[PDB]
Amino acid sequence: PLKAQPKASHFIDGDYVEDNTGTPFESIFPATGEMIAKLHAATPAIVERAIASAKRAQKEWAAMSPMARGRILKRAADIMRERNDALSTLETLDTGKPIQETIVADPTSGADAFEFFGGIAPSALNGDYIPLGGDFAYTKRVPLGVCVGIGAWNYPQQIACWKAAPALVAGNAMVFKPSENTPLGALKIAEILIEAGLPKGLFNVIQGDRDTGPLLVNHPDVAKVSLTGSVPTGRKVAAAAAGHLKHVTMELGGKSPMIVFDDADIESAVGGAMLGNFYSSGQVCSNGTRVFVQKKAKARFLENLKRRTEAMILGDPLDYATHLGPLVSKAQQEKVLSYIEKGKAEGATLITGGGIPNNVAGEGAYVQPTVFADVTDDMTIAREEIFGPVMCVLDFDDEDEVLARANATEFGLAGGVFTADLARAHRVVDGLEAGTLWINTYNLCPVEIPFGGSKQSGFGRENSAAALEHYSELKTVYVSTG
Amino acid sequence: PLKAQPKASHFIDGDYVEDNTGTPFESIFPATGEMIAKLHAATPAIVERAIASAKRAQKEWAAMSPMARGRILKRAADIMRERNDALSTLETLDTGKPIQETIVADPTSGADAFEFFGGIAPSALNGDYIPLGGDFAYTKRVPLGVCVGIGAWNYPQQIACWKAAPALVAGNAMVFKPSENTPLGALKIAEILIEAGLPKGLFNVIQGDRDTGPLLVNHPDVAKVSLTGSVPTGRKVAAAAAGHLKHVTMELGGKSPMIVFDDADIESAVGGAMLGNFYSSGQVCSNGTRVFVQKKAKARFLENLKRRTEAMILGDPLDYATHLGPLVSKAQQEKVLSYIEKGKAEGATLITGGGIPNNVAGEGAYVQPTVFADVTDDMTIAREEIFGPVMCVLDFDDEDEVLARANATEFGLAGGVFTADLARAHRVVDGLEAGTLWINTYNLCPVEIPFGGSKQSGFGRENSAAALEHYSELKTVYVSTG
């Protein structure tokens, strides 16, 4: 009688659907190692069924007005709000992330995308009338067809909604495959959508295998792939999809730089770093941020950070007082502690953290929130991206120096700057090679603004009206008048 | 001294550049077989130089205002217009296309892109200010970096310009590789841009062999690839580019449907079919079009067509009287008259054409423009595309029936409908799965309107403001105000 057993592994054509011949896997609650659900990865028949059901549904959806489609999405967001407590608790069970975070940042933000896209479509989906001096043309923003979304394990509900909302509003159908790690929230989204009046088949969810992603991505009836994941998955998925001439968009992560100048609001800069590395998860902070502090602020910065970091309550993520939950496995705890020692060995200064805590216990696998300072570029810790509560603080003296250093990365997801100086703020943001920058704050992704990266962090944007360019294409109709 | 010998095979960083170590190749005037130029395919050192120079130049160009960038492009267009005679003679030499098409449709259309993008950029390139109740964000449309353009042999100068214009205006640099078949016009585009005040290195042109594409498309400093080509090449370039996480856009052709209903203007429709299969050298038109004619219109349509068609004048493309040039090789000739005999035997009725003309010679290798009626979907002729003056006219009865047959194709570049009826015209065009559609005309591609394909004809658009989306990305800056 498992804690979060869904009715079946998949949700296809308006109801729960099982195939118990698919690779079995379990959803595990990190804190207790308790098994909360037993699932099966899609079989090939489950894949063909999800895509065929999407393809069949889609044409009627595309013929409806934007406003009509928009209304269903708005009703879904409303239901999601009614259900925020259960959806967020389910997210905490599935991810291990603190409820206090989950209840404001995860499903709510997913609801925000359904609500935003549902409201802007009746204007943002308009094309052009183009006068040509006798003749004229018009352009229509038409859906691509059947889209595939591949999710990752960081804020899984938010990821599913951010892909589903612009895809559906634009007139597409979507088959969505959540991460094997976090299979449960996407099914609720699918169920909610039907209760909101979305026709069956328009948003189908199937669990996955190592085999599942490649069957969806190479399928002849799929027009478009959207992926959130790691670079090596992204490269493989982008080559396969493009090789079939499918549209592709992805967000691939990458530690981003946060730069704090002498004249920063210190307490503000500290909250930003803490968000980016500790309480921090979700799309941008999943993997950590590199914090650069200017010399004359180093000392106020470390001391406010030490104090606050040590105030953090570690514990059961289902409890509202917890700031930081345990890690996914003991193997993670290991990995994070060698990393720590690798840093102590390198010569970086330990500000706070470094060990297994007491007393929080039990039964989770915890690491104290930990700070390294006097970190330098060459250091193994600075170089290797990690999942865990560890902050690397690098010193710098000059603006040109840090820009150079901050930019010398493969990735270009995000970055921010703390300065009180007008000129400096806009300059540093202009010089940073990243998709999304913050001035005097960090990690805020309101659905009104575009989200995505540069360079090896992938392409395309989620949120804002701009997301729709990825889920539609222009059809042009030239009208001979004579 | 050869007829059209450039100073050197390549144009890099402001001047003509040779490397005689590269694979030698020749341009040959398709009529006389005369060798007009000797060239070398790029070596790896040419590739690197071309890329490194575009990378160096691009920084400062990005720094300039859209208007300042636009002025250079507008000056380039003006120069192209002054040299229209020489530019178009050269296109005719390099392609075999009649000077009467070439003089209005090729460099003119190219010059149109430079002019159009030069003028609209100081508005079109604006990002957003997004109010957030107290904070705000702004978005900036930033260039991608170094773009690679891969040319095809139909309308070489137009392709070069239609890629360079939006890429340059947006603040990128471009290395452009024309097709081996048509190496010469792209070099004049490059020289002209320099004359217009384009900084050196921003638009470089290198010749290619089998190995050049892969060197370009895999290079670590290239941010984006734009290809005009066939589906086999498109598939390999897309997968390679996308595997390195580069942006990709492509236009891959494909035979498009032209649907002539009962109530149509037959002379107009006939002319559109002729522009679609005979003096058809378009990005749209270089592969042919499947003409569907409704029951009643067949007889009128065929009669008008047969007369007009036999009136076409074949001969030396450099002559202003010529409607139709010879075919590129004698191997083109042999391959197409087999297509002719293939069709005949299949039961397809020959309406006109079918043989080599006398004496439209010499020197050219000529086949009469030919028409088949009574053609069905199962016939070889409807099945295989080709490049040569052969039209297939297929009969149909009902509108639902034609839509299904016109959509029953993996391609989706373009299409047209000829009907006097208002509703049918907008309905058919809405029902067709293509990027660009014409009502009561065909093959018009003014720069003001988007051009590109759907399905396996590719993705992305050229021309209109929409082209700028594929040559820039949104950088989002969130400003915390308080």
Coordinates of N, CA and C in Angstrom, one line a residue, chain B residues 255 277 289-292 339 370-373 375 381-382 390-394:
Chain B
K255 N 9.8 19.1 -54.3 CA 8.6 19.3 -55.2 C 7.4 19.7 -54.4
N277 N 8.2 25.0 -63.5 CA 8.8 23.8 -64.0 C 9.8 24.1 -65.2
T289 N 7.3 21.1 -59.8 CA 6.1 21.1 -59.0 C 5.1 20.2 -59.5
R290 N 4.3 19.5 -58.6 CA 3.3 18.6 -59.1 C 2.1 19.5 -59.3
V291 N 1.7 19.6 -60.6 CA 0.4 20.4 -60.9 C -0.8 19.5 -60.9
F292 N -1.7 19.8 -60.0 CA -3.0 19.1 -60.0 C -4.1 20.0 -60.6
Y339 N 14.0 9.5 -68.1 CA 12.8 9.9 -67.4 C 11.6 10.1 -68.4
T370 N 8.8 19.6 -71.8 CA 7.9 18.6 -72.0 C 6.8 18.4 -71.0
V371 N 5.6 18.0 -71.4 CA 4.5 17.9 -70.5 C 3.9 16.5 -70.5
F372 N 3.6 15.9 -69.3 CA 2.9 14.7 -69.2 C 1.5 14.9 -68.5
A373 N 0.5 14.4 -69.2 CA -0.9 14.4 -68.6 C -1.2 13.0 -68.2
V375 N -1.2 11.5 -65.6 CA -0.2 11.0 -64.6 C -1.0 10.9 -63.3
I381 N 7.0 9.2 -62.6 CA 7.3 10.6 -62.7 C 6.8 11.4 -61.5
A382 N 5.7 11.1 -60.9 CA 5.2 11.8 -59.7 C 6.1 11.4 -58.5
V390 N 10.5 19.4 -67.1 CA 9.4 18.4 -67.3 C 8.3 18.6 -66.2
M391 N 7.0 18.8 -66.7 CA 5.9 19.0 -65.8 C 5.0 17.8 -65.7
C392 N 4.5 17.5 -64.5 CA 3.5 16.5 -64.4 C 2.2 17.1 -64.0
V393 N 1.2 16.9 -64.9 CA -0.1 17.3 -64.6 C -1.0 16.1 -64.2
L394 N -1.4 16.2 -63.0 CA -2.3 15.2 -62.4 C -3.7 15.6 -62.3

